[PDB]
Ligand binder design. Structure first.
Ligand SMILES: Nc1ncnc2c1ncn2[C@@H]1O[C@H](COP(=O)(O)OP(=O)(O)O)[C@@H](O)[C@H]1O
Ligand SMILES: Nc1ncnc2c1ncn2[C@@H]1O[C@H](COP(=O)(O)OP(=O)(O)O)[C@@H](O)[C@H]1O
Ligand SMILES: Nc1ncnc2c1ncn2[C@@H]1O[C@H](COP(=O)(O)OP(=O)(O)O)[C@@H](O)[C@H]1O
Ligand SMILES: [Mg+2]
Ligand SMILES: [Mg+2]
Ligand SMILES: [Mg+2]
Lengths: 372, 168, 372, 372
């Protein structure tokens, strides 16, 4: 009769809700803001920190910090503030009545998961908790059990190949290029238009620019060439102040970092080439099913036209005798949440939590021999 | 814009009911800017602002009563900050109404608009401290001092929020 | 049960009263007059200095001096005379029974505030005192917490942008053009009509001329053009002697110095252009709320039609996609006092005074780490 | 047998000379002055604009404008006046006989460089021109090829890490805090002494104050503490009028903005923290050579004692097992010029200009695929 709580603590958007549901009830950016000015009024000077949407509304007077950068957690005193805002202030449930399910990118440091379950037990007193891999839940949300997962969140971009039940942990390819690096490259590439976005409160504005304008070209060279004859690729976006900005080739040079990471100096391969590189790390028998089942979770795979370029860029690398199907579900931004609503509400799961009586005798090291 | 936040019932019996009174008097106060409510001149807006000032002082009293028994920082500092905000807003409204009344009886739309903006900030502060007092009460219900005030989590009429749209 | 005293020591009008009230009880011009003639009668020759309205009534036989020029205080021996007249002679209270609140223009010299609190402690023996910024109290009086303040008093004209509680001290723009310079420019521009006002007792008369006649045109060039066809813009004002004077374009060339300071040779921008210049020093997120909340305290914003020209002159500089609302309250001349009646009577303020026991151990340098 | 012209068009000081030389022949402030008064004499009223030192000599009667603010050029009609004064009036050469080399801060708008080379070709008719990055020439002047460059000019402050030949364009950190902002903060902080510098002709005087008085403390807190016991840190400077001024802690609060940009409200890091932030953006192998080779060009690194504080403030951030050497050459104010005298006179360079026959067929877009 009790329900389970699920909380995808992403790098840019904390999503949370109840198990068995079909949509997250709370979604808010995981920002902690400190005020940085004097505060001359005698009231409204005691509020020392702001979290979530009330920091997103007041971002002009706050230094903004994400506690999660590239999947790992660098500030625990802000992460417990964000979780305390998540459970009480927006979900309005007590943690002691519901078991909780958290989300972790693969190949993370063990100290991150250890301090995460220690904070979840010895501060909020949950009955039971479970941390799951951020990519294995995307296959639950897609309805499948085979396929490789290209989860490109805000922090990290990881490819996990999973045949029917069984993952292949020697082929989990985690690349540190994601939406925050595209946001910083859009800050760097909008300087050539004349616009200077320097503070951390303008990162939100250029993130909104990336939201509503940036698409990815099917072919990059000729689309770059037609931007020289600047006639139809410019687009105007209105700022919060009122000034309009015009954007030309910067509209599609920003997602092209996903397929050419040498633009920001990263010695790596693009997300089309590490996918074929990661399928080739697998065995030759399951390679046919992994080629034909390519799910894409994460918000950074919500650019207009990333499925077409992903298919076109794999099919020049794969052998040309069997098809590639980049299956891109339309709700994929919340996809990591949706599988979290499945696995927590599944009937055969309830003897695979981490109970509090199992934690206090074995310490926080119980989370490694239970989850992965 | 707190009518979507003011989804409650007549329960709570000390905090929620005056919050609903302040919400309906804001909803009838800011209708004067559209000019189709029961407010005609400017002096009834002064009486309305005096009503919200007295109700904000009473809410400040009740918020001070709940804040004594909260043990440490985690929500008590937030509650004290919103209490200082609602105290500043109500005390500014109180003797900002007086100067507008004395301007009225010694000699015409923006005069209402300043009190409207003050009431809007007061209402945002009061729904913020309603949320913070809910968190502070249902966080520490086993703690001693909270149990004597007799405010269980059932008495608050806060439901779970809406399903967020997955697409668009 | 005790009340607090508030005393806005302006450059042209000392206003004073009790906290919690709605109007100042004492308002009088801050003039100190020395007699300058022989005094042949054997009585009425011992009264060495006159202050306030009894100097304003007898101004023909007195050299008149304002102790405050451009916000700073240049004559302390006259300023203590004005404060001694304020507390005892017109408010009729003792300073030792009431705490006091004084007013200071921003970006003033520190020695001014230091000698001000030293005079307030070691001469009048107040229990506690506080000095507040002249512009932050105008937002208390307007009922708001966001917006920029264009406080144009008699001494200085300062623009202070304040988002909800938090000021932005790097955008406080203080310009030394105010009502006294408009009075001197009206003395200079009335010479072309034939009228010569040379002494300091005629500055009061031309100030009254500025009071009852001078308005500000919405458009300056065509209003200057219609004054050439001199038919309806002349106005007659009666002097204290009985001679009438006719005023044509001098009726609106005097407030136009507020929007074109090159008339009196000041290398600056007008109060329409330093406002948009000061909003653009702020951050791009709060710029929308600062454009739409433009309070105007100070007596020099009580010209007939300054709100319309301020709105029309900002909206040619601001982006045209969101509105400008120059909110001009009708009691704005006393507005700096009204917020002073708020902040001193506020319940959460009483642990933010400067007590006498806090002053004697730390000296007069305690006022910098308490007020700003 | 022909020589090349080099012209560092800085934000506060245009420097220019011939290639192969060791010192600039012309150095003058890049100011354009319009007269702002009546001009009652019948002669001396036709000279409509003044540039360079003849505007610096007559600055009391001129509105002064810098055409370059924060690296970009905001007034082309004044910049062509400054270049026309540079070539003809002070260098006394024709532009058609010498190829020219101009200087550009990195991460500038492309339209700035485009209009710069269009003005250099279609107005002065140079045989060939080249624009170079303002920081890569400082390593030529320092004699090195590895190291990071902290070029803090008058407009911008940019850190560029360059290993032996190869720059790292993903770590070019450009911060908009430089000597003009320190000059404005010195104008703002000298108001507390009582001195008011309001017009644009007093910016030159307070710039001279910054020249001859302002040093930077090794430790800021105890040096601030010893300024309270005001005995040995005051210094007197004589104005052009004759009034002397005394300066206490304002002598070292002005360069401290370089290491704490929160004083002027800039959400950024100081030049000690963006340097370690920019070295950490590089790769782990070249980090040892970049730590030990820290050149400092630009005039704003000519404060007395900035090398000691830069070393002390990096070595608290860097790992303590290998040394930091802030190499500060004594001629560093002209350092950007000196490398410009190297690279233009280098024998292997002369097939990497932009000839006029290469420009007219490809338009002004040839400058992007030649310089960076
Ligand atoms: N429609 C979209 N187009 C482009 N980018 C998007 C879109 N939706 C989301 N994003 C990017 O994805 C991020 C959404 O957060 P997300 O990474 O899904 O959270 P989590 O870190 O939990 O996976 C945002 O930072 C944004 O940059
Ligand atoms: N009704 C009015 N019309 C025009 N000017 C006014 C009016 N009332 C006041 N003033 C101007 O404003 C000044 C009033 O003093 P004020 O500046 O308000 O004091 P403070 O310096 O304390 O702000 C006078 O010098 C006068 O020039
Ligand atoms: N001796 C010095 N001490 C302190 N600051 C200096 C000194 N010399 C120059 N400066 C600063 O450096 C600037 C000199 O201009 P500079 O930046 O060298 O021109 P450019 O912009 O071409 O590099 C001035 O604005 C001044 O602030
Ligand atoms: Mg994520
Ligand atoms: Mg004043
Ligand atoms: Mg320079």
């Amino acid at each position: 009769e009790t329900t389970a709580l699920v909380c995808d603590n992403g790098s840019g958007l904390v999503k949370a809700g109840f198990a068995g549901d079909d949509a997250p009830r709370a979604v808010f950016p995981s920002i902690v803001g400190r005020p940085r000015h004097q505060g001359v009024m005698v009231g409204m000077g005691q509020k020392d920190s702001y979290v979530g949407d009330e920091a997103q509304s007041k971002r002009g007077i706050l230094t903004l910090k994400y506690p999660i950068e590239h999947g790992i957690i660098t500030n625990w005193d802000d992460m417990e503030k964000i979780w305390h805002h998540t459970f009480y202030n927006e979900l309005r449930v007590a943690p002691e009545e519901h078991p909780t399910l958290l989300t972790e990118a693969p190949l993370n440091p063990k100290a991150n998961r250890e301090k995460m379950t220690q904070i979840m037990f010895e501060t909020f007193n949950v009955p039971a908790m479970y941390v799951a891999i951020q990519a294995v839940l995307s296959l639950y949300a897609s309805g499948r059990t085979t396929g490789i997962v290209l989860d490109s969140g805000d922090g990290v971009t990881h490819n996990v190949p999973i045949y029917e039940g069984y993952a292949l942990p020697h082929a989990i390819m985690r690349l540190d290029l994601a939406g925050r690096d595209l946001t910083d490259y859009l800050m760097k590439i909008l300087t050539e238009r004349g616009y200077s976005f320097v503070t951390t409160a303008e990162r939100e504005i250029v993130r909104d620019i990336k939201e509503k304008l940036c698409y990815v070209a099917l072919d990059f060279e000729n689309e770059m060439a037609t931007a020289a004859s600047s006639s139809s690729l410019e687009k105007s976006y209105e700022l919060p102040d009122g000034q309009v900005i015009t954007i030309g080739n910067e509209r599609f040079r920003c997602p092209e970092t996903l397929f050419q990471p040498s633009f920001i100096g990263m010695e790596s391969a693009g997300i089309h080439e590490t996918t074929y590189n990661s399928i080739m790390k697998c065995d030759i028998d399951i390679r046919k099913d992994l080629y034909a089942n390519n799910v894409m979770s994460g918000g950074t795979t919500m650019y207009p036209g990333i499925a077409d370029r992903m298919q076109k860029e794999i099919t020049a690398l794969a052998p040309s005798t069997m098809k590639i199907k980049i299956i891109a579900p339309p709700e994929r931004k919340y996809s990591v949440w949706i599988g979290g609503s499945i696995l927590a509400s599944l009937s055969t799961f309830q003897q695979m939590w981490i109970t509090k009586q199992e934690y206090d005798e074995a310490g926080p090291s119980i989370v490694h021999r239970k989850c992965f | 814009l707190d009518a979507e936040v003011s989804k409650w019932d007549d329960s709570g019996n000390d905090i929620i009911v005056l919050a609903k009174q302040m919400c309906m008097i804001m909803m009838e106060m800011t209708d004067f800017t559209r000019g189709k409510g029961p407010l005609k001149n400017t002096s009834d807006v002064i009486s309305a602002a005096k009503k919200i000032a007295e109700a904000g002082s009473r809410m400040d009293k009740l918020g001070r009563t709940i804040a004594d028994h909260c043990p440490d920082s985690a929500c008590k500092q937030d509650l004290l900050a919103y209490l200082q905000r609602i105290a500043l807003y109500c005390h500014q409204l109180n003797i900002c109404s007086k100067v507008k009344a004395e301007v009225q009886n010694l000699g015409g739309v923006d005069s209402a608009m300043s009190l409207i903006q003050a009431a809007k900030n007061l209402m945002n502060a009061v729904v913020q401290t309603v949320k913070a007092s809910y968190v502070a009460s249902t966080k520490y219900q086993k703690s001693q001092g909270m149990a004597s005030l007799n405010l269980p989590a059932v008495s608050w009429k806060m439901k779970a929020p809406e399903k967020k749209p997955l697409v668009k």
